[PDB]
Amino acid sequence: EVSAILVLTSSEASTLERVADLVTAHALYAAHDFCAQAQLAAAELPSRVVARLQEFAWGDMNEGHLLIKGLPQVRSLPPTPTSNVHAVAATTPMSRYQALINECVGRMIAYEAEGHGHTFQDMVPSAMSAHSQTSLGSAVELELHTEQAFSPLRPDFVSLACLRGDPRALTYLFSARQLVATLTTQEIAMLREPMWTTTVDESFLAEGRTFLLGFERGPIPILSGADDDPFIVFDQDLMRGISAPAQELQQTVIRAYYAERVSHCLAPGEMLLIDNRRAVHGRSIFAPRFDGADRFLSRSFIVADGSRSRHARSSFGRVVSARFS
Ligand SMILES: O=C(O)CCC(=O)C(=O)O
Ligand SMILES: [Fe+2]
């Protein structure tokens, strides 16, 4: 299991519910005002909660993730949308609770090329099966990855709030610290070498869309940073080793992930913060019904520094333009 857990008491959950009334702007149509109101209102959250979130945000020895339990109950939840294009989560009370927690940690951001720049994306099963694929997506394991491995503007954190869970849908987490503990000195040194080229994810592609950084990037290393607190960039579908040993080292990371990954089945009222520099994530197979009661998460992204993406956004805008990813 996860172990890095923050459990809100009923009094803390009640304070959070009250503080959410200070966030009144439309999350989709006035994203910057919505996020700025959440950042200001987050000062009213219980100090014990704020302390834990700031410690996690600092990063040093943070475990790669933070699971938050005991959020106020999801009460009049609409049916789970059958597609992930509606942005239903963005108008629920859970999205306000998620914004308050997010804005303690850092600045919320969105990407034009990822779910049409929605402040909160609906993470719901897709019935879609493209040419290469032999299954709709939930029918296969979502492989270990860091979010936007190809992009220097990738989020620092991935935020997932659970509206409806599925008991067979396990979220898998595996930290860069867990990886390094299983490797030899030589494997660690090689993972720190720029031996992997990156490719823009197919979902980021569009007619007439050109990326300033091109379609193929790198070579880049898989590991970087401090020896005792390494950062990881990984994605087997979008990363190709420049040589046979670099390709074999990707397999070594995958085997270590299967051996050491921790799992958690997200349930209503829970929120998971993933440190996108310190951990990789994945998801098991599950069997959605597309009946209105399927697994439904609200996903959002966090960056420590909004100035790093200013060149890619408009003034008082929260959306990174596609060509800059
Ligand atoms: O469905 C999950 O548990 C995680 C999905 C995922 O890859 C994400 O949140 O980026
Ligand atoms: Fe992901």
Q: Locate tokens 């992009």: which residue?
A: 151
- 193 vs 65: CA distance, rounded Å: 26
**In Å, how far are 68, 133, 140, 289 from 294, measured between CA atoms?**
21, 22, 17, 7
- The helix-helix angle for 10-19 and 93-105 (nearest 10°) equals 100
160 within ligand 1 shell (Cβ under 6 A)? yes
- 100 vs 105: CA distance, rounded Å: 9
Q: Which of 121, 283, 299 to mutate to test the pocket of ligand 1 (most atoms within 8 A of CB)?
A: 283
297-318 in b/e form (b: 16+ CB < 10 A) is bbbbbbbeeeeebeebbeeebb
> How does DSSP classify residue 139?
T
- 216 vs 211: CA distance, rounded Å: 10
Q: Are 294 and 288 in contact (CB under 8 A)?
A: yes
Which technique was used to obtain these atomic coordinates? X-ray
Q: Which of 140, 143, 171, 298 to mutate to test the pocket of ligand 1 (most atoms within 8 A of CB)?
A: 171
* Other residues' Cβ atoms within 10 Å of the Cβ of residue 178: 20
SS3 117: helix
- 149 vs 157: CA distance, rounded Å: 13
Q: Residue 271 belongs to what H/E stretch? A: strand 271-275
Atom of ligand 1 nearest to the CA of 299: 9
Nearest to 123 by CA among 233, 272, 320, 8: 272
Residue 281 annotated as lining a ligand binding site: yes
* Other residues' Cβ atoms within 10 Å of the Cβ of residue 47: 7
Ligand 1 center–CA 32 separation, angstroms: 24
Q: Looking at the DSSP assignment, which residues form a beta bridge with residue 299?
A: 121, 160
Q: Are 64 and 264 in contact (CB under 8 A)?
A: no
- 240 vs 197: CA distance, rounded Å: 5
147 within ligand 1 shell (Cβ under 6 A)? yes
- 75 vs 279: CA distance, rounded Å: 32
Atom of ligand 1 nearest to the CA of 274: 9
Q: Is 181 exposed, middle or buried (0-12, 13-18, 19+ CB in 10 A)?
A: exposed
Kindly tell me the sign of the dihedral angle through the C-alpha atoms of 226, 228, 230, 236. positive
Assigned token pair, 227: 């020896």
Nearest ligand for residue 234 CA: 2
Assigned token pair, 117: 């720049």
Ligand 2 center–CA 204 separation, angstroms: 14
Q: Which residue has the CA at smallest separation from atom 3 of ligand 1?
A: 171
- 162 vs 80: CA distance, rounded Å: 12
SS3 223: strand
Residue 147 annotated as lining a ligand binding site: yes
Documented resolution in Å: 2.0
Q: Are 271 and 101 in contact (CB under 8 A)?
A: yes
283 within ligand 1 shell (Cβ under 6 A)? yes
- CA 37-43-46 angle, 5° bins: 130
- 204 vs 154: CA distance, rounded Å: 13
Q: Locate tokens 């493209």: which residue?
A: 130
105 within ligand 1 shell (Cβ under 6 A)? no
Q: Which residue has the CA at smallest separation from atom 6 of ligand 1?
A: 282
Strand 5-7, strand 65-69: pairing: parallel
Q: Which of 123, 238, 270 to mutate to test the pocket of ligand 1 (most atoms within 8 A of CB)?
A: 123
Residue 118 annotated as lining a ligand binding site: no
Atom of ligand 1 nearest to the CA of 160: 9
299 within ligand 1 shell (Cβ under 6 A)? yes
